Structures are given as C-alpha cells and as structure tokens.
C-alpha cells in the first residue's frame, strides 16, 4: 500500500473536442481516469485523488479525496474548450499537494496533454530544477495532437530527473485511433 497522493489532471482543452479517438477523447480519458483511480485505490486505499484542469483557469474542481464519487460527477460536463496551460499547471498542482496533510506521501501527479503548448524552455527548466528541489515525480500521459512528435515534454522529462531520478516518465500519445485500454496498457504495468 505505497504512499502517494495521485493528482489527476484532466484535459478539457479545446483540441480535445474532436472524435479522432474512439467515441470522444473526453470519454476515453474519462475511462482512463476511472482505471487509474481504481488502480491507485487497489494500490492503496490510504492515498487520495483530487482533480485539476488546464483550462482557462486551473480550477480545483475536487479536493484530494479518496472517494471517486465526486470524480465521477466532475468528469461530466467538463466544458472541454480553452487554451492549454501547463507551466503554472505544475505550480498549481504542487501547491495543491503542499495543501495536503501527510507529507510523507509522495507528490505523484499525472498530466494529460492533448493540445499544442506554448511553453518556454527556460520556464520548464526552472520547473525542472524546481521539482528537483521539491521531491516530485510526474508521469505525463500525452493525448490528442501537439506539434507532432511532441516537443518540450521530451525536454521537460529529460531535464526533470537526470542522475538517478527514475520516477518521472513521459507517456507520449500514439497518433492512431486506438482503444483507450491499448493506450493505458503500458501505463497500467509501470511508468
């Protein structure tokens, strides 16, 4: 029953509004949230999961809670329209998990990126050294499209955990209309 507090970050960005994935991108990532919340529930019932977005504002829709009923409520009518927001997405998730109570639990976050981001490389490398000085591991599960063969996230995860980091990954998006279980079939094994 490993100790973390898994912070799911939903993807209600405007490029997620199409149907290049299976019915709708929203529904596939919603079932992805279902399988990761039950997977981390069976991984530990002690740890708890709140959600956050990358919309117009990174809103704390759910506080970090162990029950998934509010998760099931808030995955509906998500308004999937708005500019992506990443760089202060790290900051809002980090301070949201400094609003925890048991700080021996790992600040584990998952990020859902399905839109072209406009980050600066220096901003994300300040975030890289920041999260090195903040004891955080984030596995980023990419969705949709970006600048194709997604860029700055290879850079961010590479600058994140150099010299024996082994805790942060980058699940890039497969650009094929595949089943969502095939997208999570490697992240359900490990990072």
């Amino acid at each position: 029953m490993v100790l973390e507090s898994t912070m799911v970050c939903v993807d209600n960005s405007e490029y997620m509004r199409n149907g290049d994935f299976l019915p709708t991108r929203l529904q596939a990532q919603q079932d992805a949230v279902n399988i990761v919340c039950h997977s981390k529930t069976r991984s530990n019932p002690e740890n708890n999961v709140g959600l956050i977005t990358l919309a117009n504002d990174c809103e704390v829709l759910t506080t970090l809670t162990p029950d998934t009923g509010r998760i099931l409520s808030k995955l509906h009518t998500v308004q999937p329209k708005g500019k992506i927001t990443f760089c202060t997405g790290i900051r809002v998730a980090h301070l949201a998990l400094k609003h925890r109570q048991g700080k021996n639990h790992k600040m584990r976050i998952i990020a859902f990126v399905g839109s072209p981001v406009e980050d600066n490389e220096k901003d994300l490398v300040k975030l890289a050294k920041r999260l090195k000085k903040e004891k955080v591991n984030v596995d980023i599960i990419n969705f949709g499209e970006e600048e194709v063969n997604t860029e700055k996230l290879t850079a961010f995860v590479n600058t994140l955990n150099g010299k024996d980091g082994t805790g942060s990954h980058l699940v890039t998006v497969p650009p094929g209309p595949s089943l969502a279980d095939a997208l999570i079939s490697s992240p359900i094994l490990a990072g």
Binding site: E14, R17, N18, G19, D20, Q79, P80, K81, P177
Partner: protein
C-alpha cells in the same frame, strides 16, 4: 461527400496544395485545424466561387462536427451571405442555423447579429427597436468576447440611423471605442470614423465637450490627420467661448446638419459659458450680475433668465436669482479635468488646509492635554 469535395477540390494550380490538405483534414477527424482551415479557405480573398458550392459540404461538416464553436460559423457565414446577397434564401438558412445550435457559448447573440447583418439589406425600422433590445440582455456575465459588442454596436449604429435618435450613437460609440484600442483595419476607416463620431456625438444632447474624449489618446493620430477645424472647434466648445469666428468656420466646413442644429448648439454654448465663467473666478465672491452673462453669451436682457433657468432645469448650475440687480447667485461649479496649474493649486490649497488643521489641533491638544493626563 468525399467525391463532393473532390469535384470542387480541383480548383487550379498551386492552391491544390491546401486542397490536397483538405482531402486529409476530414480523414484524421480533426475539428480545429479543420476549423482554422475552413477559416483559411473562406477568409481566402477571391471572388469565392466555391463557397456557395461547398456550403453543402459545410452542412456535411455540421453533421458530425457536433462540438465546434459557431464563431467559425460566423466567420464563414459573413463570406457566405456576402456571396449569396439574397434576402429570401438566406433568412431561412439563418433561422436554420438559429435553431440547430445549442452550444455553451452564446450563439443566440451571433444569430441576432446575423438578423442585423441581413437587416443591413432592408428593414431598418421593422423589428429593430424590438430585437436589438434582447441582445444586450443576453450579453450578460461575460462582455469580454468583444465580438458580440462589436457586432451589436454595428446594428446599434444602424439604430442611430433611425433618424430620430442622436445620443445613442454617442453613448454606445463610447462603449465600442472603449472596447477597441487599435481598430486593426487599414487606417482610412478610423479617420472618417472618429470624424463622424465628432460630428454626431457633438450633435448629442447632454454632451457638450466631455473632454475625456478630447483627450482620448487613440484618436490622437486621427486628430492630427482629420481636417483640424473640427478638433479646433471642439477646443472652442471645450473653451466654451461664444466665439463667432470658429463657430462660423464649422458652418463653413460642415454644411449638412449644422443649420438644422445651429440654434440648438448656440443655445448649448450660451448655457455652457455659465459653467466656465463660474469656474474662472475663485468661487468666493462670485455672485454674477446680468452684465457679464449678456457680454459673454451676447444675448439680450430678457433672455438671460431663460438662459439660467434652462441650466437650472438641466442641473448644471445649483444657484438662485435676485432681480433687483439681476444678480444670479452662484452656489455651484462643474467638476473639471485636472490640469497642471490645477494639480499645483490642488496640492497647495490642500496643504494650506492641512497645516492649519494641524496647527490648531496641536494647540487644542497641548492646551487641554494635562487634564486628560
């Protein structure tokens, strides 16, 4: 449908690079690069022979489009009804678009501005007074779209061209000019825009200068490039002097709608000279007699009473009248924009009051301090 786009896809040389991109847009089921690329193919400056053909494919897009914001529907429908220009077949298509959209963004406002944009054809009185009214009541809780207020203000200015209205253009032009900073057009619209703003809003009722717009700093290049008789006569209205020369030079320049408004504007400056002759004098021994009114306003004896009671009726003076000397008593002055000497007089007289209050309070405190103890 793919053949329906192949047959109109063959369009010429070179341009088939993005036409052969278009034959891969719908295949990948992207609906935002497709949105921007419909915006590209319709924003495309041509005669646009293919939009009246591809609008059936736009219905085919609207079939399993099913989420995309109809701001792109506006950005296509402007060129679409610019190609159609038919008041019969486009109003029905307009009402179809009005009923087939239910998205979370306000689309009823863009439908009402489509009603207004096809009201550019005819019917500038029919249902205008009624259906303009609902739009700003739908413009609630987020005016920061600013496309909604632009497209609403355009039909609001069309409502100003419902001749018997004058202050509406001024009032909502201040709103539009507040929500636009650069007019993001080839500049030549701005000059006649601020020019007719000057004209029409100067022909307003309660407005006389309101020199916040005379110091409106994005029409300053316009005030340098407009024919500067208008800016100068606005400086005369701000200066409020009756001043027959430049207020006849505007009658030299602006011939239409100045003879019909001539006695009105001269009556307005005849009441405007009061709220400057009381502002020039330092507000202490300021009870004005008939003479300086009849000298500034250059009107006769038995009209200055009408002149002052008009301003008393409006409320841009709060005084009273004796008539044994025809002394009109002054208990009022207009709040006026702080200039450099006004800055200095502000700080100096404010300090003058402050140090006097302090110096007397210190004497009160020290005189009765040791009985407080």
């Amino acid at each position: 449908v793919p053949g329906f786009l192949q047959q109109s896809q063959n369009s010429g040389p070179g341009q088939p690079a993005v036409w052969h991109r278009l034959e891969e847009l719908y295949t990948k089921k992207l609906w935002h690069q497709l949105t921007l690329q419909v915006l590209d193919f319709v924003q495309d400056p041509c005669f646009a022979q293919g939009d009246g053909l591809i609008k059936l494919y736009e219905n085919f897009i609207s079939e399993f489009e099913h989420r995309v914001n109809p701001l792109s529907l506006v950005e296509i429908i402007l060129h679409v009804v610019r190609q159609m220009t038919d008041p019969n077949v486009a109003l029905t298509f307009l009402e179809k678009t009005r009923e087939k959209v239910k998205s979370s963004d306000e689309a009823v406002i863009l439908c009402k501005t489509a009603i207004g944009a096809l009201k550019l054809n005819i019917g500038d009185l029919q249902v205008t007074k009624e259906t303009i009214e609902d739009v700003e009541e739908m413009l609630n809780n987020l005016p920061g779209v600013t496309s909604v207020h632009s497209r609403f203000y355009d039909l609001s200015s069309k409502y100003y061209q419902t001749i018997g209205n004058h202050a509406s253009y001024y009032k909502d032009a201040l709103r539009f000019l507040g929500c636009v900073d650069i007019k993001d057009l080839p500049v030549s619209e701005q000059q006649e825009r601020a020019f007719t703003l000057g004209l029409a809003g100067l022909l307003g009722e309660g407005v006389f200068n309101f020199g916040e717009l005379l110091m409106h700093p994005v029409l300053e290049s316009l005030r340098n490039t407009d024919r500067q008789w208008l800016i100068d006569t606005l400086y005369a209205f701000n200066s409020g002097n009756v001043e027959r020369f430049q207020t006849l030079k505007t009658a030299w320049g602006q011939q239409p709608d100045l003879a019909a408004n001539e006695a009105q504007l001269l009556r307005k400056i005849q009441l405007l000279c009061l709220m400057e002759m009381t502002f020039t004098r330092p507000a202490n021994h300021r009870q004005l007699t008939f003479e300086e009114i009849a000298k500034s306003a250059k009107i006769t004896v038995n009209e200055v009473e009408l002149l002052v009671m008009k301003a008393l009726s409006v409320g841009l003076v709060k005084g009273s009248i004796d008539e044994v000397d025809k002394r009109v008593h002054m208990t009022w002055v207009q709040p006026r924009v702080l200039d450099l000497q006004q800055i200095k007089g502000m700080k100096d007289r404010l300090e003058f009051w402050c140090t006097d209050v302090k110096s007397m309070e210190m004497l009160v405190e020290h005189q009765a301090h040791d009985i407080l103890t």
